[PDB]
Design a binder for this molecule. Structure first.
Ligand SMILES: *[C@@H]1O[C@H](CO)[C@@H](O)[C@H](O)[C@H]1NC(C)=O
Ligand SMILES: *[C@@H]1O[C@H](CO)[C@@H](O)[C@H](O)[C@H]1NC(C)=O
Ligand SMILES: [Mg+2]
Ligand SMILES: [Mg+2]
Ligand SMILES: [Zn+2]
Ligand SMILES: [Zn+2]
Ligand SMILES: [Zn+2]
Ligand SMILES: [Zn+2]
Lengths: 476, 476
């Protein structure tokens, strides 16, 4: 059992592992950046125990990226808010500069929602993908969200409001769609987006007009400027003499001819991809399946590549206080990191996992070891009503019953994938959490991540190791 | 302002600092171990912003131990509970073995509250203070809690229930005080406690009987066996030919003759010491003042020393959801680390800061940069009532008004040092939180703390760097 000799051997071994660490002081060829949107340290702990429940190891289970020797903390406050949104944080960890709430790829001079600031080049921050391209290397993005959402957008767009995913969004804010480029336009017509070898995720809707109908669903598009950006993208690649493929389901993705495909656009939903627990496994590729194909394509570039993979709906599930779903999203991303580890060489590939910000998830006491993380924890000594292990500081989970008592979750509630666990402060969408988030790194220069950093440090460190961009460099 | 150039220089400097790290691969002569009881990562972030509010730096401020280059994460589950108490965690991080809820210094064979198990030497786990003693080096302990409380007790005691601080506690559990040694007894009559050079904190009550009255307050003691343990402690020291001092107030501590004093017992309260915001600064020494004298005493040992300093009422305040007091307790500990750093030599002294377990504190959005961390964050779009930036997943803060609405905190509330910030799940005493906690380290072999570790790894790593104990060692 877990007795004295057991823990002592457990510690001495972790000690041996730690004394056996070999530093990797060699250039990074490849960088694969995983981003769990909203993935607080409490999400990671709870997901570890959730995973353990599936495997039978329970609290002793390990999350794949926790096998890395280097972890660090990341401070996420931005230029105007203590609790950052997904846009300003992406600008920090992908372009190296902190910024204002709702702004992508522009500095804190920006006034949110005012398109004029996205016309001023001096205010532009440039992404690590931009740097990889400037260096003659390939770039790609994979996400479970719309490919125009804040996180992926951070690798290529410069907009004064992250809501401006397509031209209908710009118009909704009374800005001029003729001069205010939306994110979907930027991905297809401007750098670095137009040079991405791989683009996968959701958001077909932002790429074709109201007059046209969606592949698969036949839902009218959102564009109001008549542009058919997917065909524009396909034509552009063809006119360059390259082979390009556009796919929208799992079988077609898996059937892609990797050796002969130069460019791959895979858009698997009109909107964000379906969540792990609701998706049709036949029609939707999983995060690890996208990750795999992406790596397969990008690794043809012998000079190296940068790929962003986002576990994006972790955040959306937490916003609704839908903790069961949030944990399943998280593990989809944990399995993708394992996919990436198994396919690449650590003497040449940095795998970095982080979060853009947290969520107000907490893990309360005092359930026994091996208890399902999503179960009840006990009964309250104040109102004699049950409470769950997991709960939140903010969100719609807060519930005063008709007779003015605290809602008591039931056993049916716990199993319901749409059940909202309790919060302390009611809100229609839970707020993000301002606590520092984790960073975990493996590969070349993984030891540049030991302490506590400003979130914007990340890419500057990554550029040093990869030898890209205009800052201090390993090759320098 | 915080524009593009600003953030880029910020990151390049942090990068320069990182590339300048020099490893310390030399033996540790000294080990100073700071333990923030219940000091979750969210507590550290919130305390960082709280400190900034005092210094005018706000979210840009840095906690002293955040200047260290090495941080790591610690997994705190124990052998029977997902969310650990202070007793089992202390056993883990001070003796290197995880154990059952409520148990100190025995392994998981122990059945809580069954004294028989504390009679079986084969189930004993030994503390890093024991190991320093065995190596001919000095040891001490400083805390804001009773000196018999779980945390300090982890350095010396072996009991089947952490409630057994004095004999009256043992009797209350129907165990035999004659053969079931309470914690206060063990500190004075058994090793390693009898050999500590320094003992500071509170809890005089556990050391003298009901028939006797407290120095200072004249409160009858708790002991029911007539023992006067302080005079037993003094007499033991004198009969060894050593000088000893017993002090109970700040003036007297500060007046202690350091060069001529071999042993120091400073007990400043009948019970736990008063909280930072309620203490009488003339009568009670601060956590940094204790730390200073402790180091002054223990550094006379040319062979080295181990010192535990606990910021212990962080936890007690969180239990009541009293967040304002928790943050002041935390900063008292932050200032002690600065005191320790300003007095010792990093080529020879490890300073490690960690928590035993967290608390369910969250940092909600969306207040502006520079907003007082303890202020309101905004108004709920569900019930049109204010909510605070800080709140908890568990505790007595949950409050449904008489008319069945969500209590609305007032401006008066926020300034009241006894006001209980809102929780999501009502409980008389908030539960601890199961989320991983931080570790931050400086000095020799600080680079043994880089990733993610079981909480019991800590002392094994510390022993290696200090060359103590029976495990793998740097001197080996
Ligand atoms: C948007 O910014 C421009 C550019 O300086 C300014 O002239 C204009 O009035 C701003 N709009 C608003 C609504 O503040
Ligand atoms: C306590 O432990 C002893 C020692 O093995 C055992 O004989 C005794 O019955 C136990 N007491 C309880 C309450 O189980
Ligand atoms: Mg996202
Ligand atoms: Mg304690
Ligand atoms: Zn986000
Ligand atoms: Zn969000
Ligand atoms: Zn504790
Ligand atoms: Zn506690």
């Amino acid at each position: 059992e877990e007795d004295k000799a057991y823990w002592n051997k457990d510690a001495q071994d972790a000690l041996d592992k730690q004394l056996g660490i070999k530093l990797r002081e060699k250039q990074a060829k490849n960088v694969i950046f995983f981003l769990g949107d909203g993935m607080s340290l409490s999400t990671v702990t709870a997901a570890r125990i959730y995973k353990g429940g599936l495997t039978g190891k329970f609290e002793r289970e390990k999350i794949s990226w926790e096998e890395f020797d280097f972890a660090a903390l990341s401070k996420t406050y931005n230029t105007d808010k203590q609790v950052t949104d997904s846009a300003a944080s992406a600008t920090a960890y992908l372009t190296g500069v902190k910024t204002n709430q709702g702004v992508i790829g522009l500095d804190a001079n920006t006034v949110r929602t005012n398109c004029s600031y996205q016309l001023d080049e001096s205010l532009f921050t440039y992404s690590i993908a931009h740097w990889f391209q400037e260096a003659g290397r390939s770039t790609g993005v994979v996400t479970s969200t719309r490919v125009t959402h804040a996180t992926p957008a951070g690798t290529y767009a410069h907009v004064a409001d992250r809501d401006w995913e397509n031209d209908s969004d710009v118009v909704h804010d009374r800005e001029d769609p003729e001069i205010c480029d939306d994110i979907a336009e930027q991905l297809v017509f401007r750098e670095p987006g137009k040079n991405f070898k791989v683009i996968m995720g959701g958001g077909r809707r932002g790429f074709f007009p109201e007059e046209a109908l969606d592949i698969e669903d036949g839902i009218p598009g959102e564009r109001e400027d008549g542009k058919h950006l997917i065909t524009d993208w396909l034509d552009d690649k063809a006119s360059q003499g390259a082979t390009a493929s556009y796919v929208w389901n799992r079988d077609d993705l898996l059937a892609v001819d990797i050796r002969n495909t130069d460019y791959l656009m895979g858009l698997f939903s009109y909107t964000h991809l379906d969540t792990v627990l609701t998706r049709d496994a036949e029609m939707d590729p999983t995060l690890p399946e996208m990750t795999k194909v992406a790596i397969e394509m990008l690794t043809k570039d012998e000079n190296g590549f940068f790929l962003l993979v986002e576990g994006g709906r972790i955040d959306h599930m937490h916003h609704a206080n839908q903790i069961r779903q949030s944990l399943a999203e998280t593990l989809d991303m944990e399995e993708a990191v394992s996919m990436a580890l198994s396919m690449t060489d650590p003497e040449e590939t940095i795998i970095l996992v982080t979060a853009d910000h947290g969520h107000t998830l907490t893990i309360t006491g005092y359930a026994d070891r091996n208890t399902d993380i999503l179960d009840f924890a006990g009964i309250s000594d104040l109102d004699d009503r049950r409470y769950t292990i997991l709960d939140y500081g903010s969100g719609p989970g807060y519930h005063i019953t008709e007779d003015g008592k605290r809602y008591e979750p039931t056993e049916e509630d716990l199993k319901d994938i749409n059940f909202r666990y309790a919060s302390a402060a009611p809100k229609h969408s839970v707020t993000h959490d301002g606590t520092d988030v984790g960073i975990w790194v493996n590969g070349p220069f993984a030891h540049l991540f030991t302490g506590v950093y400003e979130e914007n440090y990340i890419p500057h460190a990554l550029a040093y190791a990869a030898c890209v961009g205009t800052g201090r460099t390993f090759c320098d």
